[PDB]
Amino acid sequence: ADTLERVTKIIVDRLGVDEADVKLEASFKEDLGADXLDVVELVMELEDEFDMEISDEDAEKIATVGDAVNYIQN
Amino acid sequence: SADTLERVTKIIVDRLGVDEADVKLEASFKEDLGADXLDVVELVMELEDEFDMEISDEDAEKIATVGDAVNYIQ
Amino acid sequence: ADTLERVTKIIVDRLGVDEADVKLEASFKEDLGADXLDVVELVMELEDEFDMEISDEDAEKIATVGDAVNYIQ
Amino acid sequence: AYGIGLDITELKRIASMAGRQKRFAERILTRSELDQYYELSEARKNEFLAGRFAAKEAFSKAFGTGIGRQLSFQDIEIRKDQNGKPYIICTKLSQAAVHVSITHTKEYAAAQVVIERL
Amino acid sequence: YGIGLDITELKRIASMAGRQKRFAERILTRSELDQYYELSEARKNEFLAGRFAAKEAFSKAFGTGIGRQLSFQDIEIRKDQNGKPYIICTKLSQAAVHVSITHTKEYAAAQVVIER
């Protein structure tokens, strides 16, 4: 739960997308207006904020905000 | 008419770079009046509207000059 | 070198850099950040100032400032 | 290859035109592209429209004649494949492969096309 | 066989005050100058930015850039009745060339493919 709060803040602070528009099924690229460069800064932001590393292989594996949360929490 | 010509010059001047003393029947849109592709399709749309008509991409290519449009508007 | 003085004045106006920036071993591409277009406008200004002819090839040799000064002499 | 083509389009210019002329998109897009355009937000719309326009301009140049008598905007259609990448189906082509790449920045939409053998 | 891409800012090429004419003499062939003089101001800056973009794209494609191995004067751009540009460059045939040129308010861009 807490992780969505932080994850959402990241998304909002980066892609700058309204807020309350951050749904677990919300696709970063399709539903939030993220190009390839935005998604790489996003992943990097996540790497710091949670002290984890996300490979290019893994970055592809996570399309939605929920995918982000799930990846983070396990 | 000679009416159709004043309505076409008004539309050209409004739309393109052109002044008002350059819309001479022989003046080509792309060549003489500084028009590019996006400029002429808009130009075509002004005409379709200003004279309630339908101008296909085919007919757009026929009306290369100011006089071409006039003739076409008859 | 008043040649350099004249070369720098041209470079601080076609490229816009400051001054101390223009050293003798300063690279046109790497330190001054001049591209292919900047380079030819630069070579033409020199053609003007010092009244000479720099061929398309000649220009690809003047790597840095010092080199251009040398070619002008 | 048989022909190539490149086109860069200003997003603000497309945005103003569509604002100024509600039928601009109908002229440029096929019905299928058009239905796709309607499902998008106000933002996503101008860039989808600018991108398809760029891809059609570039194709018409690769095709060799530009848009007009030998080729309409209506005869060119951009489709998304399995994973979403764009490709082109043109009514006037039969024995050539067509490649397209479409890219976007904050201000510009750009596309290139290659028409070639096989 | 290679490809070349170039994008040049229009302002910089129009921005050449009395310095633009000598610039045209350097970038254009004789057949291209004749055409350039016969043009308007805006159409002149566009014609020039496109030739510069095209020749740079072609030079990148050819693999050497402008210099000892290849000159602007060796590259000539012409247009057929459909307005399709094509390059002539007797700098060693044995290859077909494809070129495309486009303009925007700020930029002039070109791509070239030289193949086997």
Add this chain to the structure above:
Amino acid sequence: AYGIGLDITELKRIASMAGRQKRFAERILTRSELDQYYELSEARKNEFLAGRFAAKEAFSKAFGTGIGRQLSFQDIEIRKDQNGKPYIICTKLSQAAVHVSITHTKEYAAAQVVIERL
């Protein structure tokens, strides 16, 4: 896969890294590309970085898979020959030829890539 790729990337977006550009550089560049980058001045670092991101985004487009499982930024390296002509060596590309071209404006890095049959 055989295809073409085009990518234009705004310089400001890469420059706006400040304290993130090191991590970003490391994610984007191979070992030898990174060594060149550390040797550059700050304005030159952003240009170098935007050109490599564009060249690699374009390449992944032509490769048809995008960046991920089948292709990492680290599997693609842009090198320059004696004449300063850029070419790509990729660890995942099999029996095919690759062509690349990079260009810069004050605000942009653009690259195009062609992956062909040998």
